[PDB]
């Protein structure tokens, strides 16, 4: 108790260093204690309502309330206080801090999560400031990552409406990221056909920005794989073709953001193929068509995706093997530094595709390796993949050479 009284005393001092220290100590003790939490909640209410406190100290004071999750009534009182705060202090910094603190409080105390989501959606649709909107996006992302099931159909409807209405690319990208994160959980089932989410996802998958397209096609992939409703079977072609468009867009951009979007698209089509084999055939076809004209890193990621496709789904078609062999031939004299990983990934897809034994094409592969590689480690990894997939004669040749 004496420590608590010391914290409470120093909070109303004059020296700003002592006041900041008191705020930090109050944070820690309110994290630990319970009675101290409600006492400090009352003091912070009457202090923020007071006029002596400067703006910066008010900013520092608000996140103390994130520890008021010790009991229901205390959390509700803190919620009323935060509502008062956002009403009567509408400038950017403290609405930012206060609604983020409310998000954390709702995350800790699960009772008030629906109204918190409703408030966040309200601030997303109404408030004009870009920064407040972006914080709303981040907080909804956190809540989606931490409690997707609590989301209602109305919240998803509001979020989709907000995504449709807003013209800014960054806000659209962020809220579609939130929607994509929601789509990879049971939130789709709770949501349920043609609706706002489907129209939004279709519209965004053809958007100019790479990230928006990636998140839209991921929403389409999740909605197609999760449920087998008739409209979903109708729109599953749209997801595939949009995925192909994203693939051709990212096949030569050669930037880290492009690499991330390409990884997202390839993972999406791997999951879709795991869900839809009859779509997987066309997925394989477009992958092979774009393999030849893609860049080196794009080819590496494409080969990883195709290896996953082939490994999970057995009937890939030996017609693949010709295209892979042709691609392997031309890549033999492509580069020196990034050629190594492309070679090992290409050899991996060759071995996975060859469900049966090999032929003189193996002679071509080993001749290309001996002529161009001159590295050994890549030879070792190719032999390791050969032994993995059962092409043991190729492994014997490579190990003997190595």
């Amino acid at each position: 108790k004496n420590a608590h009284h010391s914290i409470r005393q120093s909070l109303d001092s004059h020296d700003n260093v002592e006041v900041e220290a008191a705020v930090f100590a109050a944070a820690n003790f309110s994290a630990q204690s319970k009675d101290f939490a409600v006492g400090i909640c009352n003091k912070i209410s009457e202090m923020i309502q007071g006029l002596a406190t400067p703006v910066d100290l008010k900013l520092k004071l608000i996140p103390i309330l994130q520890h008021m999750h010790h009991d229901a009534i205390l959390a509700s009182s803190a919620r009323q206080l935060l509502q008062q705060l956002v009403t009567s202090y509408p400038s950017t910094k403290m609405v930012i801090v206060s609604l983020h603190t409310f998000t954390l409080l709702a995350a800790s105390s699960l009772v008030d999560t629906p109204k918190q989501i409703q408030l966040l959606l309200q601030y997303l649709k109404n408030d004009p400031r870009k920064a407040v909107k972006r914080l709303a996006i981040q907080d909804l992302k956190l809540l989606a990552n931490k409690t997707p099931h609590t989301w209602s159909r109305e919240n998803i409807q509001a979020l989709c409406e907000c995504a449709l209405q807003t013209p800014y690319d960054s806000l659209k990208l962020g809220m579609l990221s939130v929607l994509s994160t929601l789509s990879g959980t049971i939130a789709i089932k709770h949501y349920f056909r043609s609706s706002d989410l489907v129209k939004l996802a279709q519209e965004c998958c053809y958007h100019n920005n790479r990230g928006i397209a990636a998140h839209g096609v991921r929403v389409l992939t999740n909605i197609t794989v999760s449920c087998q409703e008739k409209d979903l079977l109708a729109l599953e072609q749209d997801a595939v073709f949009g995925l192909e468009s994203l693939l051709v867009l990212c096949s030569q951009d050669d930037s880290p953001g492009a690499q991330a979007t390409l990884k997202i698209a390839l993972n999406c089509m791997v999951k879709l193929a795991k869900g839809r084999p009859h779509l997987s055939q066309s997925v394989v076809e477009t992958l092979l068509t774009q393999l030849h004209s893609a860049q080196d890193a794009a080819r590496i990621l494409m080969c990883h995706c195709l290896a996953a496709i082939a490994m999970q789904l057995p009937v890939l078609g030996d017609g693949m093997l010709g295209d892979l062999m042709e691609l392997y031939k031309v890549i033999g004299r492509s580069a020196t530094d990034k050629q190594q990983e492309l070679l090992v990934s290409l050899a991996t897809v060759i071995f996975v595709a060859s469900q049966k034994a090999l032929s003189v094409e193996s002679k071509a592969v080993i001749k290309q390796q001996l002529e161009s590689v001159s590295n050994g480690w890549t030879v070792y990894r190719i032999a390791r993949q050969a032994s993995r997939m059962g092409n043991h004669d190729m492994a014997k040749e490579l190990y003997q050479s190595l």
Binding site: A260, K263, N375, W377
Partner: peptide
């Protein structure tokens, strides 16, 4: 972040001592 292939063997962020020496041996 997500990974394109889960059973990919080329992931070498974690290299054990055996593979560490093996790579350094012949590179």
């Amino acid at each position: 972040d997500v990974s394109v292939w889960e059973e990919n063997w080329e992931d070498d962020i974690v290299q054990d001592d055996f593979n560490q020496q093996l790579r350094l041996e012949m590179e």
